[PDB]
Structure 1
Amino acid sequence: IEVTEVSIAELRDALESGRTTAVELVQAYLARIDAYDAPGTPTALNAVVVRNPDALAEAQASDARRARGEPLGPLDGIPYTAKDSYLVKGLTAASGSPAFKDLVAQRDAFTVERLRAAGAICLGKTNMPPMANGGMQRGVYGRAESPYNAAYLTAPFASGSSNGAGTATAASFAAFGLAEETWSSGRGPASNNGLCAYTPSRGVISVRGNWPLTPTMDVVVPYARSMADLLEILDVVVADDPDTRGDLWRMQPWVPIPKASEVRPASYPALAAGAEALAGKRFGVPRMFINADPDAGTSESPGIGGPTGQRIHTRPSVIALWEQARKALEAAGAEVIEVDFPLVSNCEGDRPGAPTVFNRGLVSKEFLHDELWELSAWGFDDFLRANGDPKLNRLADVDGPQIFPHDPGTLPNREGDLAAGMDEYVRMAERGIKPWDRIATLPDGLRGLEETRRIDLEEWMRRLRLDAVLFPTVADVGPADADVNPASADIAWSNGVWVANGNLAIRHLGVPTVTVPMGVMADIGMPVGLTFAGRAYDDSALLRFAAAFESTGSRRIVPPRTPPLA
């Protein structure tokens, strides 16, 4: 059968009626990978970088269960891909880093455990920059290319590390995909590839067995081509993980975090709805993301580094898609209000009187320093210890200069020297790393982060009577040669483009989001998403809003570079 642009429900229907088998499905996806992804093909998208050699045997066992009339559940026999940061037992888990190219996973990540128990089949692992500490920079496997337009990047350049997952899921190299986000490494690639994606509130999906980057910020992010598929995934993966090791927010005792089983609904697929779910709702769109905020960037020295705090120049064709999205929401009975966005303005100090996260006093400068260094060094070292690969199980034994080497011939990283930056973590391990529960600044820091969200988002949405905040996921897309072309790098590194709209505040403060396709820019053929954000633990309502918006149109297209075969 054809698998291009086919939904999970259609696949399960085919498996149940005998129209196909799990083996036939795996072969159909591997065929697309071999025709479009592998080196030496005309497209050479280079999205899938590590194959699962047992995939066909796993498919065999799945069909044996079905012939015996006992499928494990709705995802039995459904193929997916996982970002190279996920531990998949028996395969390498380099996190795209040359220093870890031979590290082998001794167990599964929690997400993978749930999917394995459900009979889902990992076809392989997807591309990413070293340690997810970037966007489109080339790692040990290079980088992935866009299936929509070879001239533009498949993700934001500075934070879009799930760049293989975005290409692979949009090109139907599997039914769905698994990604991860620290700044915008989840929302970014979803936007450029027309995907649905969900960034959960804190503690909803265990991050055990996932390569950490910043333990206060890392979250799991599922990718799918439709909201219905996204809900199929969540139904299976969202559950309580009895093992808390490595998951900072589920280990810490100072901030109340609810159990996953307390946050999820009884049934995720039941969250789908039509336009009726938008009637009478109030949605606020930040002026700063629709070219309506002349005050952005008008303080004396705005930002907290890079292009932050600067006025965002949104592409005209993205504005045109936003206006149609607004009309669709209003036609469905919703109210869309242009508003400020304190969450970002008070993090980046972008206008007179606005504080920054560094000078506001809700979190201390020393906590922000420990977050970047001491806590992250502990994250790396404890992940290696927990995995327990006999050949490499301590951060102090790592080849520092090889963690994130610079790609020769490309322009410098505007965030600084990241090869030396990452090497410092090994020097730290050699001096001795304090565990997380002995870092003195942590208690006040975690409470300060939650306090910031309460003031800037939750109480703010109450007085405005907003049901959600929404905006284009990104302001523009960087050209594909932003790594070597100065003019292209200037665009790719500008605010709203280097990182998805929201910069660091979204993940730093634990804001749940859902992203769906907003359409395709008419001038360059690149997709752009619409992001819904809301109060912590309002995830269910946000998923429903996204599903309802999706139902009002058909805003996704098959990538023109990866058509159905034959």
Structure 2
Amino acid sequence: MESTLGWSVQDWLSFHSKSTPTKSLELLENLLKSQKPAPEDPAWISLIPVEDLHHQWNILQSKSNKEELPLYGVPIAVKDNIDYKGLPTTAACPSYLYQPTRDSYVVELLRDAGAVVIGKTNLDQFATGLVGTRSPYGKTPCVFNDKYVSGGSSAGSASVVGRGIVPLSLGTDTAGSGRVPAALNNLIGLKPTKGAFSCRGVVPACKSLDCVSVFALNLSDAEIAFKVMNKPDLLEDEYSREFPKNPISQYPKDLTIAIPKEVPWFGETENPKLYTKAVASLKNTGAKIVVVDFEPLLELARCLYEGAWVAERYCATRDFLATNPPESSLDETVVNIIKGAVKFDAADAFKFEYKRQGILQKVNLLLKDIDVLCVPTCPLNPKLEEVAQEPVLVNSRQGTWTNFVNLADLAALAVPSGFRSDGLPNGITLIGKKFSDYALLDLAKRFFSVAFPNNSRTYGKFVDRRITVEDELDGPSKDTLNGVKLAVVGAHLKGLPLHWQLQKCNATYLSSPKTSNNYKLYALPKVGPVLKPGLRRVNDGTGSQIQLEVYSVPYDRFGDFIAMVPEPLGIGSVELESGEWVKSFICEEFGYTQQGTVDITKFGGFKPYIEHIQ
């Protein structure tokens, strides 16, 4: 039949719509057959049985609104860290193996959205490392060159996406594990705001810091996965937290992007070139780039490394370690790290927690006037043998830019910046404050269109395919709004010189209806260099339908918007064509009752009129 390697989610959905339930089952059965487990393919700890593929697919057929399921019959991989009930969970530790009787909340959500889990994916043992070599199941290679490391700890999940077996996969990230493998494999790596994705059914390893993360080939698919898994789960995950309403969806073109004053490369010469060029490209989107001392952030990173956070991994594994399981089941570097936790008492954990809170005061003072950090994802592209030689120091260095994100309650999106001379990829990570995940996506989109002009952007190993349409975003869905419905008629319309005031207050365009038959529109005597209309509700009988744009203005922001609204205008209510009332600009009678006032109703809107002039 037909090749499936490197399909977007959209590619998969298109197939399903135009195919029959049996010929789409076959395509997945066929994808499943081409995969190999165990040591043959180090990327897979385990793969589903054909019976299980049938089961998932039957369940899928029972649901009665497919073609509204944004991941209908789309295959996905899951880090062997995260429970799927159809397969065992291992944490890349053969004797730790266990059978979950229930799905991760995250997996359960993706299944509800129509996806099919194909296998569990290999990782550094107990999700401990940035290298991907620390698994008794095998070392996963870089999708581009088998001499190189895939990155970890989410190594299987990057590999599998990088070569387009599957268009989305799940990883986890405490201090880099969803970001480093994206850079080494030409992927999108989304590390969401903490507590946004539930960690119910993931094996705890630094519970207080840990996030479920996603890999994708493109912005579009990372967005669909985010919308699917961003769901509260307060009573079953102690660190879950609900996204607030009115999430920002775009940074201003003007945004302050901070970069570090000192960028250590540890001898590496190719990667600096990609970073320099990437910063040039951000400047060209119109961003303000500001160079900033990252001292406090690095103090925070050191606090991670010096502190007792290792006691979190130890807490999740000590009962198990005391079981004394066969040495061959264990990675020794991992186990030595985890046992570093024994030398810390409760008093110690607190002492470091104090120091962490103190650093954060400094970190919060620093970020107050910055919108985003742009950081190299990792300094190196490690060779398999380089990390065999120095099995700890390579790891430390690969966390140069990753270690402080979760401690500081930030979000992050690792995104390609191009290729070095030797044809390996790397890239940048963009770090935003709590709940900016949607705006980071969009910022990547804007970065891409400059760094990869003329649709020249590659993805995964697919060095000779180009992104056309797949990096486009819907933005946050209307579900998430909670604001006043506001109708504008004048200088706040798209394209006129007060539109920005709506953007400043994080307004969202809803629609463009007309008033009912009840309205006149005036042009007022110009005084500023801006001309200003006023609406008049009338009932002699002689009104027209005036044209409007309607915006949702977040409740907490409406104060900021109305404060910019000078006499004689005001905010009242207006009647739309359909009979709904909606807040709107109005005008004191004194306003349109001056010498200089011009009856503009004729034009049916304010645009038409500001063109019959200029």
TM exceeds 0.5?
yes
Match of 1:78 among 74, 78, 89: 74
Counting only pairs closer than 5 Å after superposition, residues 422-461 of structure 1 correspond to structure 2 as 422=338, 449=356, 452-456=359-363, 458-461=364-367
Does structure 2 conserve the Cα–Cα contact (< 8 Å) formed by 1:151 and 1:480? yes
Partner of 1:144: 140
Give the TM-score taking structure 2 as reference length.
Answer: 0.66
Alpha-carbon distance between aligned partners in 2 of 1:341 and 1:123, rounded to the nearest angstrom = 41
Partner of 2:14: 13
For 1:196, give the aligned amino acid.
I
- Displacement of 1:63 in angstroms is 6.5
Alpha-carbon distance between aligned partners in 2 of 1:446 and 1:543, rounded to the nearest angstrom = 32
Match of 2:149 among 150, 153, 163: 153
For 1:316, give the aligned amino acid.
T
- Displacement of 1:220 in angstroms is 0.8
Does structure 2 conserve the Cα–Cα contact (< 8 Å) formed by 1:143 and 1:164? no
> How much is the aligned-residue C-alpha RMSD, in angstroms?
3.6
Alpha-carbon distance between aligned partners in 2 of 1:328 and 1:174, rounded to the nearest angstrom = 30
- Displacement of 1:534 in angstroms is 2.3
- Displacement of 1:333 in angstroms is 1.6
Alpha-carbon distance between aligned partners in 2 of 1:531 and 1:318, rounded to the nearest angstrom = 14
Partner of 2:158: 166
Alpha-carbon distance between aligned partners in 1 of 2:321 and 2:156, rounded to the nearest angstrom = 29
Q: In the TM superposition, what whole-angstrom CA distance separates every residue of 1:152-201 from its partner, at most 9, and x where no partner exists?
A: 1111xxxx211111101111121210000122111111110111112222
Does structure 2 conserve the Cα–Cα contact (< 8 Å) formed by 1:280 and 1:333? yes
Is 1:197 the equivalent of 2:103? Answer: no
**Which is richer in strand?**
2
- Displacement of 1:122 in angstroms is 0.3
SS at the partner of 1:534?
A: strand
Is 1:399 the equivalent of 2:303? Answer: no
SS at the partner of 2:114?
A: coil
Alpha-carbon distance between aligned partners in 2 of 1:117 and 1:516, rounded to the nearest angstrom = 28
- Displacement of 1:338 in angstroms is 2.4
Alpha-carbon distance between aligned partners in 2 of 1:494 and 1:146, rounded to the nearest angstrom = 16
Gaps of 5+ in 2: 466-614
Is 1:327 the equivalent of 2:327? Answer: no
Counting only pairs closer than 5 Å after superposition, residues 322-471 of structure 1 correspond to structure 2 as 322-347=275-300, 357=303, 368-369=307-308, 371-373=309-311, 375-380=312-317, 395=320, 398-400=323-325, 402=327, 405-406=330-331, 413=333, 418-419=334-335, 422=338, 449=356, 452-456=359-363, 458-462=364-368, 465-471=369-375
Q: Please identify the structure whose Cα radius of gyration is greater.
A: 2
For 1:460, give the aligned amino acid.
L
Q: 1:529 to 1:45 in 2, by over 3 A?
A: farther
Alpha-carbon distance between aligned partners in 1 of 2:336 and 2:393, rounded to the nearest angstrom = 21
- Displacement of 1:57 in angstroms is 0.7
Q: 1:314 to 1:510 in 2, by over 3 A?
A: farther
SS at the partner of 1:357?
A: helix
- Displacement of 1:470 in angstroms is 0.3
SS at the partner of 2:177?
A: coil
SS at the partner of 1:481?
A: helix
Alpha-carbon distance between aligned partners in 1 of 2:213 and 2:167, rounded to the nearest angstrom = 15
Does structure 2 conserve the Cα–Cα contact (< 8 Å) formed by 1:211 and 1:380? no
Partner of 2:411: 512
Give the TM-score taking structure 1 as reference length.
Answer: 0.71
Does structure 2 conserve the Cα–Cα contact (< 8 Å) formed by 1:205 and 1:260? no
Does structure 2 conserve the Cα–Cα contact (< 8 Å) formed by 1:280 and 1:334? yes
Does structure 2 conserve the Cα–Cα contact (< 8 Å) formed by 1:344 and 1:502? no
Partner of 1:117: 112
Alpha-carbon distance between aligned partners in 2 of 1:510 and 1:64, rounded to the nearest angstrom = 40
Q: 1:64 to 1:209 in 2, by over 3 A?
A: closer
Alpha-carbon distance between aligned partners in 2 of 1:467 and 1:119, rounded to the nearest angstrom = 35
- Displacement of 1:341 in angstroms is 0.8
Alpha-carbon distance between aligned partners in 1 of 2:222 and 2:448, rounded to the nearest angstrom = 12
Partner of 2:526: none
Does structure 1 conserve the Cα–Cα contact (< 8 Å) formed by 2:187 and 2:460? no
SS at the partner of 1:482?
A: helix
Alpha-carbon distance between aligned partners in 2 of 1:378 and 1:207, rounded to the nearest angstrom = 16
Is 1:57 the equivalent of 2:10? Answer: no
Alpha-carbon distance between aligned partners in 2 of 1:217 and 1:404, rounded to the nearest angstrom = 26
Q: In the TM superposition, what whole-angstrom CA distance separates every residue of 1:460-517 from its partner, at most 9, and x where no partner exists?
A: 132xx32211021011111122354x4xx38x83487x42332532233332111111
Q: 1:129 to 1:358 in 2, by over 3 A?
A: closer
SS at the partner of 2:401?
A: coil
Partner of 2:255: 281
For 1:227, give the aligned amino acid.
L
Alpha-carbon distance between aligned partners in 1 of 2:192 and 2:71, rounded to the nearest angstrom = 21
Q: 1:145 to 1:466 in 2, by over 3 A?
A: same
Q: What's the % identity of the aligned pairs?
A: 21
Q: Comparing 162-171 with 2-11, which one deviates more in the overlay?
A: 2-11
Is 1:26 the equivalent of 2:28? Answer: yes
Is 1:544 the equivalent of 2:442? Answer: yes
SS at the partner of 1:124?
A: strand
Counting only pairs closer than 5 Å after superposition, residues 34-113 of structure 1 correspond to structure 2 as 34=36, 45-53=41-49, 54-58=51-55, 60-61=57-58, 64-65=61-62, 70-71=66-67, 73-101=69-97, 103-113=98-108
- Displacement of 1:23 in angstroms is 1.6
Does structure 2 conserve the Cα–Cα contact (< 8 Å) formed by 1:468 and 1:533? yes
Q: Comparing 526-535 with 442-451, which one deviates more in the overlay?
A: 442-451
**Higher relative contact order, chain-length normalized (CA < 8 Å, sep 6+):** 1
Match of 1:474 among 372, 375, 378: 378
Alpha-carbon distance between aligned partners in 1 of 2:304 and 2:216, rounded to the nearest angstrom = 37
For 1:84, give the aligned amino acid.
D
- Displacement of 1:449 in angstroms is 4.2
Alpha-carbon distance between aligned partners in 1 of 2:245 and 2:192, rounded to the nearest angstrom = 10
Q: 1:448 to 1:231 in 2, by over 3 A?
A: farther
- Displacement of 1:202 in angstroms is 2.4
Q: 1:172 to 1:450 in 2, by over 3 A?
A: farther
Gaps of 5+ in 1: 251-258, 290-310, 349-355, 360-364, 382-393, 408-412, 429-433
